[PDB]
Symmetry: C3
Subunit: 122 residues, 3 copies
């Protein structure tokens, strides 16, 4: 399974902070198997780590269409909107992450902070 081999090569680069090479491997995995939710998820993580928030959002949305139970993907999707100043969207995704995993202290903190910044009062 060359698609799974590429997903694994991508994970090894991602763990080492080699995000561009991780993205190349994940893209190759996704060209052979577009229904790999784990590869969409980690492709989104690599883009997030590079500061490419819009690209992270698009990859997390694909991962979530395939695996809606991935609590960490909802949390990371929330963080990508939070980084863009889209607080209403971040709140909604943090709440979904917390419905799935109530033990995510980072999701709790970020949700608390996004609620302070959500209002037109800035």
């Amino acid at each position: 399974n060359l698609a799974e081999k590429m997903y694994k090569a991508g994970n090894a680069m991602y763990r080492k902070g080699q995000y561009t090479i991780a993205i190349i491997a994940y893209t190759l995995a996704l060209l052979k198997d577009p229904n790999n939710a784990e590869a969409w998820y980690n492709l989104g993580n690599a883009a997030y780590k590079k500061g490419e928030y819009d690209e992270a959002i698009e990859a997390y949305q694909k991962a979530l269409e395939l695996d809606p139970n991935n609590a960490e993907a909802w949390y990371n999707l929330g963080n990508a909107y939070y980084k863009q100043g889209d607080y209403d969207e971040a709140i909604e995704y943090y709440q979904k992450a917390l419905e799935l995993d109530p033990n995510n202290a980072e999701a709790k903190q970020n949700l608390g902070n996004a609620k302070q910044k959500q209002g037109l009062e800035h």
Copy 2:
């Protein structure tokens, strides 16, 4: 757009002097989108920087079929033939680069030099 993402990954490696990895990313971009003139152009640049002149020529020819207005691609195609000792061809491509961008001092110098070396007098 995974093809554009690969073109961008290729540019990031190319800028850092990681030519082999740039070539992998450009090849993946070109397998998904063969009509990407920018990716053919930069694939030719990466091959040129590795000293692979024949491969640079083939990539520049594809880029130029798609984007004949790329003055820098005509200039680089001229340099790849110049590196092979094919002065008649270099002259022809430098003249085309200069018809498009008369302000390329490097194309002017290289054209001047290729004209000195063109003759059978060596």
Copy 3:
């Protein structure tokens, strides 16, 4: 030929000990040209060097289906089974490597050692 270009990029990474990147390039070469015995062989070598013996076995089997005269591939297939403790299989593949190249001293030594360990006496 982009498939041959990927095989060459893979060899350049493999020679430098950049096994994960070599695997990415070989996979791309094999997606475009699955009948490239040299690319299956070197993909098996890269997996072997990473300690991924089962993956090396699968790649060597593909290389050997296409090029049964590759004496070094029979020898490396023998080493991958030897690393898994599968001595009967290692012996069989070392004997085939030695029928093709009787001058492989490493195959001779490894065959001699696998024969000592083959028995139920451990």
